[PDB]
Write a protein that binds this DNA or RNA. Structure first.
Length: 108
DNA sequence: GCCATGGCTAGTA
DNA sequence: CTACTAGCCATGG
C-alpha cells in the first residue's frame, strides 16, 4: 500500500464520521487495514490544509482526550469545532480536554 | 545508514 | 485518576 493510498483511505474514512460524533487515530488505522499506522493517521490529519472539508476535528486519542501538538492552535480549534457540534467537553485539571468516549465514539 | 520528530497506544506502575 | 515505557513508523535533515 502506497502512502498516498493510505492518506486517501484515512481521509475517506474520517469523512464517514457522522456530525457530532468522534473516532480515534487507532480506530481509523485499524479501520483501513493498517492497525499499526495509528501515528500516521495523526500525520495525515496534520498534513491537511485549513480549508479542507475533512472533519479532522472528529478524531481524538484513545483516552478520549484531545491530543497536544506542536501547533497549539489546533488543539484549541478542535475543542471549539467539537463544541459547535454539540459535544460536551470538560477540562481536566492540568488542563487537558476530555470527553465521554463511549458515548460519542463512532461505530460503523 | 543514523538521528530527531511527531495530533499514537497498550501495558505497566 | 496521573506517568511512564516499549513498540511503533513515516518523515526528513
Amino acid at each position: 500500500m502506497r502512502m498516498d493510498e493510505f492518506y486517501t483511505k484515512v481521509y475517506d474514512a474520517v469523512c464517514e464520521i457522522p456530525y457530532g460524533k468522534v473516532s480515534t487515530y487507532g480506530e481509523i488505522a485499524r479501520y483501513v487495514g493498517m492497525p499499526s499506522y495509528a501515528r500516521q493517521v495523526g500525520q495525515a490529519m496534520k498534513h491537511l490544509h485549513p480549508e479542507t472539508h475533512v472533519p479532522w476535528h472528529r478524531v481524538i486519542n484513545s483516552r478520549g482526550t484531545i491530543s497536544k501538538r506542536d501547533i497549539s492552535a489546533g488543539e484549541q480549534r478542535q475543542k471549539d469545532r467539537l463544541e459547535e457540534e454539540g459535544v460536551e467537553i470538560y477540562q481536566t485539571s492540568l488542563g487537558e480536554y476530555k470527553l465521554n468516549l463511549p458515548e460519542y465514539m463512532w461505530k460503523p
